[PDB]
């Protein structure tokens, strides 16, 4: 007591979710035509880095992208022409994430040093400079996303997420419910809700203004390593070292479909959706990333390379292309 | 062909590439070491001998060392352990004396086994440090043996027990072509740098011999 009250609450909430759903989602949507076999081809190969690369992010122009690698450098690429725009030397080489501001004026990186650095791209002196050193966290940084030109959300090893005010430099909100190291997060296109996955094998949606968890999703056997929203901001999918991918509905509070195959036994390092949401992409520990139809749940396609190991991938805003990175220090643009 | 603006941009990109490659070449010379203790082990003593990760770099006999000790990281090491996969060697320290505190030897041994058998990170030789000699010396001439290890079946003092626990550590090493260098530290010596240097040069020789190699 009163620990039994909590399990009773879990019981009625689970039974209510079971009652509120019947589909299955086993025979539904069989009417719509399968998209068939999708072929992808490498179009460019960006080969500047000298060590494992750990994260990448697209700009809003859908032409520039930034990549972060363990050799302690940041690169801004011109994906159209494979030219390097800027090279940024990091203070601490143990970087684990990066993010591109929507306005295109700022870029952020962070990692195993517990602090998040903000870099200014448009200066009078024609060079990049540090603007802030957001240092409130205790565990290592895991992910960063720009809310706007002066608001950034972060996740760390403190089993918590934070919301900052870049000009002020003070944590203006905190989220403290995961009870386990959190690994990733993504922002809804509404730009008012976000979700985060943790090593506790559960996912929780947050309210930016309220600062309190609203819905908790579970039923996933191991760690969670990647999340991304549905294009309309009404769903999201999760990766894992469980070798299984799954998606949830916010208004239904249940799993909808699972993406697993017998041959694949390895973790999942990143996920992303297509512009229409028809194609789900995911990277794996077995050196190649598979492409999954959103709802028919089949491995529609696959991508050759890399040597090892697909650790980060993303899709442009216009959906024109897709990019992947890996521990072999190469980036490939697939179209 | 392509216009003047693109020509200038390509020139800038080539300059960036050249600078980056030169910096990488200059960086590849130094040697990287992971410091990985446990609790009240004398890793702090080793560091002083010389909130997140702490990098200490020094030069010894025209060789540049970079030593990382992830002590403040309280998170799960299964995540983020892969960062130091391309490292020359790791430095492990235990003690010897304390083994009745809960035990200490069992926890250190299981941690050592866990990091000695990893999916990646499997072919990196380990330097082993057994510090605080005098305390372990007194703990036996006063409170033998016990030992926390049963079936020890040996004499009382001193190299008997020392070599026994040492050999216990050189146990549980599945792989060949990977060595464990061991040493005894009195917490007052001043040549641990020399033994680290010797182990590192031995590892370098082993790697060189490795390609044709011709193991």
């Amino acid at each position, epitope marked *: 007591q009163l620990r039994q009250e909590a399990e009773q609450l879990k019981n009625q909430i689970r039974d209510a979710r079971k009652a509120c759903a019947d589909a299955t989602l086993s025979q539904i949507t069989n009417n719509i035509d399968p998209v068939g076999r999708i072929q992808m081809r490498t179009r460019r190969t960006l080969r500047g880095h000298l060590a494992k690369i750990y994260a990448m992010h697209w700009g809003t122009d859908s*032409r*520039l992208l930034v990549s972060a690698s363990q050799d302690g450098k940041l690169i801004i690429w*011109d994906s159209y022409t494979t*030219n390097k*725009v*800027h090279a940024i030397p990091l203070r601490s080489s143990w970087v684990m994430t990066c993010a591109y501001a929507p306005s295109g004026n700022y870029v952020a990186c962070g990692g195993l040093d517990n602090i998040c650095s903000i870099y200014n791209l448009k200066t*009078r*002196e*024609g*060079n990049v400079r540090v603007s802030r050193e957001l240092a409130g966290h205790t565990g290592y940084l895991s992910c960063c996303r720009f809310l706007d030109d002066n608001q950034i959300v972060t996740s760390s090893g403190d089993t918590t997420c934070a919301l900052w005010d870049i000009e002020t430099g003070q944590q203006t909100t905190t989220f403290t419910g995961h009870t386990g190291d959190v690994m990733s997060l993504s922002l809804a296109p509404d730009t008012r809700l976000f979700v985060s996955g943790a090593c506790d094998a559960s996912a929780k949606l947050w309210d930016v203004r309220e600062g309190m968890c609203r819905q908790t999703f579970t039923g996933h056997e191991s760690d969670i390593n990647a999340i991304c929203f549905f294009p309309n901001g009404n769903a999201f999918a999760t990766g894992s070292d469980d070798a299984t991918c799954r998606l949830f509905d916010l208004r239904a509070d249940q799993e909808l479909m699972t993406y697993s195959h017998d041959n694949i036994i390895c973790g999942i390092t990143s996920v992303s959706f297509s512009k229409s949401g028809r194609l789900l992409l995911a990277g794996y520990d077995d050196f190649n990333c598979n492409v999954w139809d959103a709802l028919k749940a089949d491995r529609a396609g696959v991508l050759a390379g890399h040597d090892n190991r697909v650790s980060c991938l993303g899709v442009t805003d216009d959906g024109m292309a897709v990019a992947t990175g890996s521990w072999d220090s190469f980036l490939k643009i697939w179209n | 062909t392509l*216009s*003047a*603006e*693109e*020509r*200038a*941009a390509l*020139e*800038r990109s080539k*300059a960036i590439e050249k600078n980056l490659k030169e910096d990488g070449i200059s960086a590849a010379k130094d040697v990287k070491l992971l410091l990985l203790g446990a609790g009240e082990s004398g890793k702090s003593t080793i560091v002083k001998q010389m909130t997140g990760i702490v990098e200490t770099h020094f030069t010894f006999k025209n060789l540049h060392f970079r030593l990382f000790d992830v002590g403040g990281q309280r998170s799960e090491r299964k995540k983020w352990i892969h960062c130091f996969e391309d490292v020359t060697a790791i430095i492990f320290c235990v003690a010897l004396s304390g083994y009745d505190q809960v035990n200490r030897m069992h926890e250190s041994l299981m941690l050592f086994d866990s990091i000695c058998n990893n999916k990646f990170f499997i072919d990196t030789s380990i330097i082993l440090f057994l510090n605080k000699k005098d305390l372990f010396g007194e703990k036996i001439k006063k409170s033998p043996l016990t030992i926390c290890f049963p079936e020890y079946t040996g004499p009382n003092t001193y190299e008997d027990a020392a070599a026994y626990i040492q050999a216990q550590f050189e146990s549980k090493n599945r792989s060949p072509n990977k060595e464990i260098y061991c040493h005894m530290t009195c917490a007052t010596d001043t040549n641990n740098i020399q033994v680290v240097f010797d182990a590192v040069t031995d590892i370098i020789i082993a790697n060189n011999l490795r390609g044709c190699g011709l193991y």
Partner: single-chain antibody
Amino acid sequence: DVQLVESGGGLVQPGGSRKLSCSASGFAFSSFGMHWVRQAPEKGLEWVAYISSGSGTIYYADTVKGRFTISRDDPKNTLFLQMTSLRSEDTAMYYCVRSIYYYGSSPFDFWGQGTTLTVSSDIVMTQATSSVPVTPGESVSISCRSSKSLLHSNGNTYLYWFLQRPGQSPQLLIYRMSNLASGVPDRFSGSGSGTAFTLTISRLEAEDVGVYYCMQHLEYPLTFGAGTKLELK
């Protein structure tokens, strides 16, 4: 902050030799390409030389070649222009301009205060006429003409616009004939076809009276248009 100061000029008898220098402060000089632009005592602007960021590429004008040379010393933060066998018409006004070229850059953003000198095919840029009467608070448009179409295969139409208020150095207004420079009122707006170009001014005020120029950057040599000035009828 960012500022370029230059003084190496003076009265020189014909056929002499001279060196010009502008000192760079407040910005990463080593990462910029530099130009020299000459202005005749009456009117007009014409490009002279250019040295790349790493001093690996140099260009000259036609009359410049063989007599003038350009050099930089990045650790010293100085630009050099050497005069030899100066002619009669070389007497004019000079400027050194910074410029950096990457994706989405703004070259020719900042100009120096200039220094004066006294002594004793190509793309054609057309502006006409040279004067239009206006009043404050009402609209006005200025048009410039070229010979070849400026639209490159990329989709970038390389046209630039500059304004020089009397008694001071010119400054950048529009780059690539569709963008707006930093620290510029938004009322300015540039547009045009592949060969014909214009401007628009809304709510014109007394600060905007001066002379305007059009420049193209499609291919060396860089060519300027004529000068068109505004009046306050």
